[PDB]
Amino acid sequence: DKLKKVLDKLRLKRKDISEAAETVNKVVERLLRRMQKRESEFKGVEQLNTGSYYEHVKISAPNEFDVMFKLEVPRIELQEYYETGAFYLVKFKRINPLSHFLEGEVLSATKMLSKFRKIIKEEVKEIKDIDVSVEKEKPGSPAVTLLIRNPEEISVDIILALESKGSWPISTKEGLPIQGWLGTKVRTNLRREPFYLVPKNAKDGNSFQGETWRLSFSHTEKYILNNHGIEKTCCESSGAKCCRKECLKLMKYLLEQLKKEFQELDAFCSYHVKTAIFHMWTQDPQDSQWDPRNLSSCFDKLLAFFLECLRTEKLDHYFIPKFNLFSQELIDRKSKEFLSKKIEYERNNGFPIFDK
Amino acid sequence: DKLKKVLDKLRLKRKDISEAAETVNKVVERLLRRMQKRESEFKGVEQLNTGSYYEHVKISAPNEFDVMFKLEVPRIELQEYYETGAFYLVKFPLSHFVLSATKMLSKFRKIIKEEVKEIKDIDVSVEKEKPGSPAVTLLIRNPEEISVDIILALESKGSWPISTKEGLPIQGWLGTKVRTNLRREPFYLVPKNAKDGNSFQGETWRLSFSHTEKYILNNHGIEKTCCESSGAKCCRKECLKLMKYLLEQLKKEFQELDAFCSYHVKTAIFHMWTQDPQDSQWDPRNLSSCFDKLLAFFLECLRTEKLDHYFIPKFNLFSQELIDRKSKEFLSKKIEYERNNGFPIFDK
DNA sequence: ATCTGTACATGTACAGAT
DNA sequence: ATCTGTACATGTACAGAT
DNA sequence: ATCTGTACATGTACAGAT
DNA sequence: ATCTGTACATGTACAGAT
Ligand SMILES: Nc1ncnc2c1ncn2[C@@H]1O[C@H](COP(=O)(O)OP(=O)(O)OP(=O)(O)O)[C@@H](O)[C@H]1O
Ligand SMILES: Nc1ncnc2c1ncn2[C@@H]1O[C@H](COP(=O)(O)OP(=O)(O)OP(=O)(O)O)[C@@H](O)[C@H]1O
Ligand SMILES: [Mg+2]
Ligand SMILES: [Mg+2]
Ligand SMILES: [Mn+2]
Numbered sequence: 001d002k003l004k005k006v007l008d009k010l011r012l013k014r015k016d017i018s019e020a021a022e023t024v025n026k027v028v029e030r031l032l033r034r035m036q037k038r039e040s041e042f043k044g045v046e047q048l049n050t051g052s053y054y055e056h057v058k059i060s061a062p063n064e065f066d067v068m069f070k071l072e073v074p075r076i077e078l079q080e081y082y083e084t085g086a087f088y089l090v091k092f093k094r095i096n097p098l099s100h101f102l103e104g105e106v107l108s109a110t111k112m113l114s115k116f117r118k119i120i121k122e123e124v125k126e127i128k129d130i131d132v133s134v135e136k137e138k139p140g141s142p143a144v145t146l147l148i149r150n151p152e153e154i155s156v157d158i159i160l161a162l163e164s165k166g167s168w169p170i171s172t173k174e175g176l177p178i179q180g181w182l183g184t185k186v187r188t189n190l191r192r193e194p195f196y197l198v199p200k201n202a203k204d205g206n207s208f209q210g211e212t213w214r215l216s217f218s219h220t221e222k223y224i225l226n227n228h229g230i231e232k233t234c235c236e237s238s239g240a241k242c243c244r245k246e247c248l249k250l251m252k253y254l255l256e257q258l259k260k261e262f263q264e265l266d267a268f269c270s271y272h273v274k275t276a277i278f279h280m281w282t283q284d285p286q287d288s289q290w291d292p293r294n295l296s297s298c299f300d301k302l303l304a305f306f307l308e309c310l311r312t313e314k315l316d317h318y319f320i321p322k323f324n325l326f327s328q329e330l331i332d333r334k335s336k337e338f339l340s341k342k343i344e345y346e347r348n349n350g351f352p353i354f355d356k
Numbered sequence: 357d358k359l360k361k362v363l364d365k366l367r368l369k370r371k372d373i374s375e376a377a378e379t380v381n382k383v384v385e386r387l388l389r390r391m392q393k394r395e396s397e398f399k400g401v402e403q404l405n406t407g408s409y410y411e412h413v414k415i416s417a418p419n420e421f422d423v424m425f426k427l428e429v430p431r432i433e434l435q436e437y438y439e440t441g442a443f444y445l446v447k448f449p450l451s452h453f454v455l456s457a458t459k460m461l462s463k464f465r466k467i468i469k470e471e472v473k474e475i476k477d478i479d480v481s482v483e484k485e486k487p488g489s490p491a492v493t494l495l496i497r498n499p500e501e502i503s504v505d506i507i508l509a510l511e512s513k514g515s516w517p518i519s520t521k522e523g524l525p526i527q528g529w530l531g532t533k534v535r536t537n538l539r540r541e542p543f544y545l546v547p548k549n550a551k552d553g554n555s556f557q558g559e560t561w562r563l564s565f566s567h568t569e570k571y572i573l574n575n576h577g578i579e580k581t582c583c584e585s586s587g588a589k590c591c592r593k594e595c596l597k598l599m600k601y602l603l604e605q606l607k608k609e610f611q612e613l614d615a616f617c618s619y620h621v622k623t624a625i626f627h628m629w630t631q632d633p634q635d636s637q638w639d640p641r642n643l644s645s646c647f648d649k650l651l652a653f654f655l656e657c658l659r660t661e662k663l664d665h666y667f668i669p670k671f672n673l674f675s676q677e678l679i680d681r682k683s684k685e686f687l688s689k690k691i692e693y694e695r696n697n698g699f700p701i702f703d704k
Numbered sequence: 705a706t707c708t709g710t711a712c713a714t715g716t717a718c719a720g721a722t
Numbered sequence: 723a724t725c726t727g728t729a730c731a732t733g734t735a736c737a738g739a740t
Numbered sequence: 741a742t743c744t745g746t747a748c749a750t751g752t753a754c755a756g757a758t
Numbered sequence: 759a760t761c762t763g764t765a766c767a768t769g770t771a772c773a774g775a776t
């Protein structure tokens with residue numbers, strides 16, 4: 001009941017969706033068409049909408065959109081980067097429009113992202129229809145972010161991605177454990193879909209920095225978000241409603257509110273809560289464990305689970321099991337205890353941050 | 357007890373499956389290669405395996421196989437046949453054939469017969485044409501007899517015809533997303549090859565949805581995991597197997613049941629799977645009740661002379677025009693008997 | 705004259721609006 | 723409840739290319 | 741255009757555990 | 759008696775090579 005009214009606050013307004021989507025789709029279409037023109041290195045690039053807005057778990061406002069510009073790259077050798085599971089060097093063996101980005105048969109991520117970015121930058125200069133600029137490059141981001149002033153502020157992440165149609169890399173063999181939940185036939189089909197490589201683009205200063213790519217499964221996550229039940233009819237018009245997406249929204253919101261206030265929580269992002277809930281959905285596969293009447297206990301067990309990930313410093317990648325998003329090397333124990341305290345406090349005092 | 361033991365009988369044997377399959381595959385591959393690799397009117401024909409053996413509901417022996425050779429054909433105009441639902445005249449390589457089903461089936465058939473004469477490593481003949489069949493049936497004699505039905509089909513890639521719009525009522529069982537996806541697939545037209553001497557008989561084709569029934573048979577649960585290695589087993593296919601056995605055993609004995617076929621049983625259980633969508637209503641521990649409630653549904657179809665095409669609801673497979681009222685009363689009394697006496701026919 | 709990448713045309717699940 | 727805008731999958735038309 | 745290679749679903753068969 | 763786990767077999771989807 002309290003949680004029901006929070007979800008009401010979080011609910012997107014169709015009027016805002018129309019105005020935001022109209023602008024966003026103009027700018028994305030124009031950008032996609034420029035990449036196809038002339039001798040462009042990214043001719044053939046294809047669009048793929050991903051992220052919360054296209055999963056229907058975008059909360060508060062339609063003000064951040066994620067778009068993959070995926071490029072199919074045949075004949076690819078992968079070199080795993082120091083057994084991390086998630087990061088790869090990409091190599092060709094043909095000796096090609098990616099020519100300028102090669103580097104001794106190693107594909108440079110930062111060279112390829114720079115050229116990509118320069119093209120976007122130039123195309124944006126030509127838009128005098130809407131108030132759109134390109135954000136200053138943020139480190140770690142595989143994106144070229146647009147800031148649209150639609151009056152209202154709207155971020156768009158154009159994510160550059162390599163597309164391989166081969167079988168997924170062995171580090172993902174034990175990942176995507178949906179057998180007891182969405183089943184083996186779904187798992188086999190999902191894994192026949194391509195996999196993607198986005199540039200890691202770190203600033204750290206470490207070996208291979210500009211040639212390290214990171215795996216991406218936003219397309220699979222989008223499918224799972226929109227086909228999330230053990231029963232084929234979950235949330236359909238002739239089926240029963242579950243509260244799975246609603247729990248994701250409330251936990252996304254707890255993390256946004258907290259991250260808005262405290263800069264201690266910079267290391268944390270929404271993908272942390274998105275990953276934790278895929279694990280919850282696997283742990284509790286049955287649609288009856290996500291009954292809308294038990295929204296409270298469902299939201300509570302998700303916090304209990306998230307709190308155990310923080311304290312034990314373990315949140316495995318859903319697709320790459322050996323990859324721990326809460327490792328010491330990525331997030332300080334300080335940062336984890338701090339967030340643990342803040343969650344425990346919201347939990348046990350009636351979620352006062354839900355009222356700001 | 358007893359039903360479990362009957363299903364042990366009806367189970368195919370791994371040995372028999374590989375001997376039948378490798379011989380059937382030799383013949384179908386050669387036939388299929390001829391339809392294109394020799395320049396013929398069916399140059400773009402593609403193979404599509406259908407029926408009980410490929411749905412894993414074939415019983416007793418692997419001795420009947422069903423194959424569609426489907427041919428893509430852009431820009432066909434469909435015309436319904438007297439609001440029958442399932443029968444249509446087709447209009448616009450094929451030039452030699454209003455696209456006449458008889459005329460195309462005959463050449464298709466001529467081509468098969470020619471190739472079968474060039475097969476000197478398999479004992480295989482072409483069965484005499486049955487009016488009423490859209491198939492070219494091959495009789496293969498391994499030490500065992502094996503029927504293969506080669507079914508000619510047109511493949512259309514538009515919307516399904518209006519008569520199906522109320523069909524496939526899987527919304528509360530397999531769901532809306534599955535229904536929309538299935539209905540994005542092509543639909544198929546096969547020949548209506550009856551001898552009845554009625555109006556347009558020779559040019560009429562019949563809708564086929566074997567490709568859709570294959571998916572349903574192999575994606576039949578409300579839960580995605582039904583019958584998977586990390587799911588629960590249901591007894592849905594075993595009920596189909598048993599109801600199929602009962603009709604096969606009766607037809608073998610009683611000439612009066614000639615007008616019945618397994619597709620009646622298959623159609624009835626689709627309706628029951630829609631009426632009872634929950635996987636737990638098909639728990640293996642309730643095989644007897646499930647089989648019995650399927651028997652009672654089938655007897656209620658007979659009593660009321662009503663068994664609508666699962667995909668084409670206004671087509672009543674149990675109409676008077678297709679099956680005589682006497683035939684249905686005859687089958688009602690036979691099933692009611694077997695049911696009330698512990699299925700004697702299951703012991704022979 | 706025919707071929708074909710691009711975009712229109714069609715249908716509907718999702719979920720916000722009324 | 724029903725009505726309705728967006729996203730998205732797939733079929734098809736045709737200007738411009740050949 | 742056609743074909744092989746790969747992965748894993750669907751099955752059966754049987755022994756050891758229940 | 760059934761359940762579980764391994765071995766054995768065929769079907770089918772699609773990537774990549776030719
Ligand atoms: N750290 C990450 N590791 C892997 N994939 C990530 C990561 N961050 C984001 N992604 C992928 O990119 C998508 C877009 O990221 P983004 O930060 O916009 O979050 P979101 O899930 O769309 O939600 P929101 O924008 O509302 O916070 C994610 O849904 C996920 O698929
Ligand atoms: N009367 C019919 N109307 C429509 N489709 C039919 C009809 N009879 C058969 N079919 C289609 O052709 C397929 C093959 O028919 P067939 O008689 O071999 O049955 P089956 O399902 O293969 O089972 P079995 O051969 O074991 O009796 C069917 O499964 C169905 O898709
Ligand atoms: Mg986002
Ligand atoms: Mg058959
Ligand atoms: Mn983003």
Ligand SMILES: [Mn+2]
Nearest residue numbers: 420421422505
């Ligand atoms: Mn047949």
Ligand SMILES: [Zn+2]
Nearest residue numbers: 229234235242
């Ligand atoms: Zn749901």
Ligand SMILES: [Zn+2]
Nearest residue numbers: 582583589590
């Ligand atoms: Zn099942």
